[PDB]
Amino acid sequence: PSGSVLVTGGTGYIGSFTTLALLEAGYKVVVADNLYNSSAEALNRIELISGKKAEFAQLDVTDEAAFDKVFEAHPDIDSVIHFAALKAVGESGEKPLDYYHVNVYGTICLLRSMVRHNVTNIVFSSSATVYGDATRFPDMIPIPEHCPLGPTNPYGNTKFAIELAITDVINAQRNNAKKAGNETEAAKWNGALLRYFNPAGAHPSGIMGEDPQGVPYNLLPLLAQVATGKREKLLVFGDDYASHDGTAIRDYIHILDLADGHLKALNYLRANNPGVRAWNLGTGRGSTVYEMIRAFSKAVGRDLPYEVAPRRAGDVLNLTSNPTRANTELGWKAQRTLEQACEDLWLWTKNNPQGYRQQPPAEL
Amino acid sequence: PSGSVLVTGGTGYIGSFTTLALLEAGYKVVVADNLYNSSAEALNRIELISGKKAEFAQLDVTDEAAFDKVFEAHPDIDSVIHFAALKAVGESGEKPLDYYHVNVYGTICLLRSMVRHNVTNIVFSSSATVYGDATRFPDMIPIPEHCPLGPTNPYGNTKFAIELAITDVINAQRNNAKKAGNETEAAKWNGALLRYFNPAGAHPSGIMGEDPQGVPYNLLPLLAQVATGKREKLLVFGDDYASHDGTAIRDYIHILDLADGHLKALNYLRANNPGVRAWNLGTGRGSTVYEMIRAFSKAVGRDLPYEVAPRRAGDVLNLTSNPTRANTELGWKAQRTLEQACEDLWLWTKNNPQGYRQQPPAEL
Ligand SMILES: NC(=O)c1ccc[n+]([C@@H]2O[C@H](COP(=O)([O-])OP(=O)(O)OC[C@H]3O[C@@H](n4cnc5c(N)ncnc54)[C@H](O)[C@@H]3O)[C@@H](O)[C@H]2O)c1
Ligand SMILES: NC(=O)c1ccc[n+]([C@@H]2O[C@H](COP(=O)([O-])OP(=O)(O)OC[C@H]3O[C@@H](n4cnc5c(N)ncnc54)[C@H](O)[C@@H]3O)[C@@H](O)[C@H]2O)c1
Ligand SMILES: O=c1ccn([C@@H]2O[C@H](COP(=O)(O)OP(=O)(O)O[C@H]3O[C@H](CO)[C@@H](O)[C@H](O)[C@H]3O)[C@@H](O)[C@H]2O)c(=O)[nH]1
Ligand SMILES: O=c1ccn([C@@H]2O[C@H](COP(=O)(O)OP(=O)(O)O[C@H]3O[C@H](CO)[C@@H](O)[C@H](O)[C@H]3O)[C@@H](O)[C@H]2O)c(=O)[nH]1
């Protein structure tokens, strides 16, 4: 094997494609999830694509004893990728305690169990919401990693709190080893703070994609529901923004390039051993809402109906990425394009309108 | 009774004088502590001074079920003052996980139990370390509340993370009530973020003071050990600072004024109901290390011996407070002075060289 990796979440959206890329790289993957917002079927789809399958452990991330059982059964893990969290921004303003309990405390349980079993590498799933609004700063768009952090929602604060925790915990392990004159043990402890932006698309085979629980709230999944008949139309949130057409700007990156960025980051940790460092995982291409509706409509064939609604509270003007650091240091670049994401997203939705609770059509 | 209050910590340094001021105000106090860094004897000293005694509950703050038992036995609490935490800055760089588990997660358990039992007011014990170094900002000294936060140690990050949690949790309770057209229920939820600076001194009766576990590390307690014979001398950390004599600057506030600030804040919450707001609890008077050694030496009689050592890592130049907000809004001002603190501190140490594990001399 080319190494072992524990993947919390794993059965989730970004988690599934990440474990897929890991197995195809030759890694041994153990997936940890309580299946709150995903299905275990995603693993079966991985086996059909890669030929390899990951071991599955069903446990709550807030259960510290459960993390111990995993490391005791797999003492060769050495590195963990952390996806397990709650990601609904609006919901975080309704019940932030559940977010602080799952995201923050869940990470605490992980780190404690990590130190206890001597797994020294962690790759955290941070968001771009930690930057908040970047228009209050001159020449801060596109957004670099050295941008001062300041979230505007409880979800962002959880991610921001974890980043501070990851830095402190890991640096302590390194500094305590340096004090004891053990530079060897110090170099082993590393952390990758990957700040995702806006993910989109699915697998080109059309057998794997995003299948969450509850009602979708993101732009593309809602557009997919319009094009499939579940939704009547789309509600554009604000048309008076400082863009050219009037809609907000985001950085939409393909899920395949997003998941591949973990492989680059994990290698950079096992190589240089820089300790803790953050990286933006975007494309650098800013796209308006109107452009996305048009891009996805072109992928489907017909133009999807929409209606203009007032601005959504907490929505920033621009969230374009400055991925120059990730391109040079990690050697990672967004291969797939924005339009290329709409094509295999629509491929996934058209063939699988009911996600994983159905069996895909005759594919190969 | 003039209200009921749960006081986590309570048996600790700032906690003891706070519960003392609460009982003297007519409040009903239930003290929660695991006695990690304090003794239960402090309560007996309170009974001797105030005549009233607080109910004691021995429990870990990371035990959510224990918090439930308290609220179920005391359904009339309605408000909680949160002191329970780990405060050693240097130690936080050695084992930050224990700090994130006790400070951050302990607060999470409290809030969850608070929402569960409908106690709506919380007064958090924040530190001035959340400001970090304020010299990187023009005209930011003395330090106002609107200073952008940026800690330099894991201990500061825990306090900073909690502040964000307190804001999000409480604002959610208010906003959810507003959405349901219930402005009455929304006004009940409030939070006071009291950012302490540098506490000093003890009770003028000399029967109550600071008696922690382990070895002291703060300036005044170490000076007290020199003047009592336990220490040989004091080690001044750096004499090349940008002050007039060369030593660092801090804001030393008497523990009695510090504890009384909670009464003012608690009243401001039950009155205006502003939701969440931060207040600095200092004097505005900046004092160097040399001035403190001289001030305490004068309180003892003889001049204490000291030796100059290089700078301590993470020590900022200035930490003077800008308490103008606390003076106007809360109607709180530091009555006692700096020199007045050294006098009753030395009174406490001279008569009680072994803290609470001894019986005080014949006092009244
Ligand atoms: N989707 C986005 O636009 C976005 C953007 C930036 C960052 N992220 C972050 O990336 C990560 C993954 O996002 P995603 O889109 O893959 O979402 P997702 O919901 O598909 O993945 C999250 C996974 O966490 C699991 N989980 C939640 N609580 C758990 C618990 N207590 N115990 C065990 N498992 C638990 C869920 O079952 C799910 O599989 C999250 O941390 C999210 O905040 C996502
Ligand atoms: N001392 C300072 O210079 C300073 C300055 C700024 C802020 N503060 C903050 O003020 C608060 C009180 O400080 P203090 O000087 O009174 O220190 P302290 O040690 O006397 O008080 C802390 C109390 O917390 C208790 N405690 C710790 N962990 C616990 C747990 N898991 N369960 C139950 N109880 C637990 C201890 O037993 C102790 O009584 C702390 O939050 C501290 O960070 C102190
Ligand atoms: O029905 C809709 C949905 C969205 N939008 C707009 O489309 C853009 C993108 O919306 P969405 O997909 O919800 O993304 P963001 O609001 O940018 O935030 C998402 O992407 C973040 C990246 O950091 C994640 O952390 C969050 O969990 C996730 O809600 C925004 O400008 C919205 O105003 C609409 O106009 N109409
Ligand atoms: O032996 C000593 C101890 C201290 N100092 C100096 O005295 C000053 C005050 O030291 P100390 O009492 O340790 O206070 P701070 O370093 O300012 O921090 C304390 O006060 C904070 C207020 O926010 C709390 O949060 C921390 O827990 C606590 O360590 C500093 O300039 C030190 O460099 C010395 O020169 N020699």
Environment class of B124 (CB within 10 Å of its CB; exposed 0-12, middle 13-18, buried 19+): buried
Nearest residue to A21 via CA among A345, A332, A323, A350: A332
Cα A105 to Cα B71: distance, rounded to the nearest angstrom: 23
Q: How was this structure determined?
A: X-ray
CB contact under 8 A, A165 and B176: no
Is B149 in CB contact (< 8 Å) with chain A? no
Is A115 in CB contact (< 8 Å) with chain B? yes
CB contact under 8 A, B169 and A108: no
Tell me, in angstroms, the distance from the centre of ligand 3 to residue A81's CA: 24
Q: Which chain B residue has its CA at the smallest distance from A157's CA?
A: B164
Residues 6+ apart with CB under 8 A from A73: none
**How many whole angstroms from its chain centre is CA B293?**
22
Is A97 in CB contact (< 8 Å) with chain B? yes
CB contact under 8 A, B104 and A101: no
Cα A275 to Cα A189: distance, rounded to the nearest angstrom: 6
Bridge-partner residues for A144, per DSSP? none
Strand A190-196 to A276-281 pairing: parallel
Going along chain A from its start, the domains and CATH numbers come out as: 3-200+251-282 (3.40.50.720), 201-250+283-364 (3.90.25.10)
Binding residues of B: 13-14, 33, 36-38, 60-61, 83, 85, 87, 127-128, 155, 159, 198, 218-219, 235, 237, 250, 312, 315
> Interior CA angle at B127 toward B91 and B154, to 5°?
35
Alpha-carbon torsion B69, B74, B76, B78, what sign? negative
Cα B193 to Cα A342: distance, rounded to the nearest angstrom: 47
Instruction: Decide: B110 and B61 in contact? Cβ < 8 Å.
Output: yes
How many CA atoms are closer than 13 Å to the CA of B162, on its beta-carbon side? Answer: 37
Cα distance from N-terminal residue to C-terminal residue, chain B: 29
Instruction: Decide: B83 and B125 in contact? Cβ < 8 Å.
Output: yes
Residues 6+ apart with CB under 8 A from A361: A351
Residues 6+ apart with CB under 8 A from B8: B15, B32, B33, B61, B80, B81, B82, B83, B84, B110
Write phi, then psi, for B263 (nearest 5 degrees).
-65, -40
Environment class of A337 (CB within 10 Å of its CB; exposed 0-12, middle 13-18, buried 19+): middle
Residues 6+ apart with CB under 8 A from A153: A89, A92, A93, A129, A314
C-alpha gyration radius of chain A: 20
Cα A204 to Cα A345: distance, rounded to the nearest angstrom: 8
Amino acid identity for residue B58 in this structure: Q
Cα B202 to Cα B179: distance, rounded to the nearest angstrom: 47
Q: Which chain B residue has its CA at the smallest distance from A169's CA?
A: B96
Residues 6+ apart with CB under 8 A from B17: B203, B208, B255, B256, B258, B259
Cα B88 to Cα B158: distance, rounded to the nearest angstrom: 12
Chain A neighbors of B112, CB-CB under 8 A: 97, 101
A222 assigned binding-site residue: no
**SS3 state of residue A338:** helix
Place of tokens 């006081």: B7
How many CA atoms are closer than 13 Å to the CA of B333, on its beta-carbon side? Answer: 5
**SS3 state of residue A234:** strand
DSSP E strand stretches across A301-357? 306-309, 318-319
**SS3 state of residue A233:** coil
Instruction: Decide: B127 and B196 in contact? Cβ < 8 Å.
Output: yes
For residue A217, give both structure tokens.
């709230």
**Contact B34 CB / ligand 2 (< 6 Å):** yes
How many CA atoms are closer than 13 Å to the CA of B164, on its beta-carbon side? Answer: 30
Show me where chain A is broken: residue before each gap, C-N > 2.5 A: none
CB contact under 8 A, B100 and A165: yes
Which is catalytic among the residues A155, A196, A241, A252?
A155
Strand B55-58 to B28-33 pairing: parallel
Q: What is the 3-state secondary structure (H, E, C) of chain B?
A: CCCEEEEECCCCHHHHHHHHHHHHHCCEEEEEECCCCCCCHHHHHHHHHHCCCCEEEECCCCCHHHHHHHHHHCCCCCEEEECCCCCCHHHHCCCHHHHHHHHHHHHHHHHHHHHHHCCCEEEEEEEHHHHCCCCCCCCCCCECCCCCCCCCCHHHHHHHHHHHHHHHHHHHHHHHHHHCCCHHHHHHCEEEEEEECEEECCCCCCCCCCCCCCCCCCHHHHHHHHHHCCCCCEEEECCCCCCCCCCCEECEEEHHHHHHHHHHHHHHHHHCCCCEEEEEECCCCCEEHHHHHHHHHHHHCCCCCEEEECCCCCCCCEECECCHHHHHHHCCCCCCCHHHHHHHHHHHHHHCCCHHHCCCCCCC
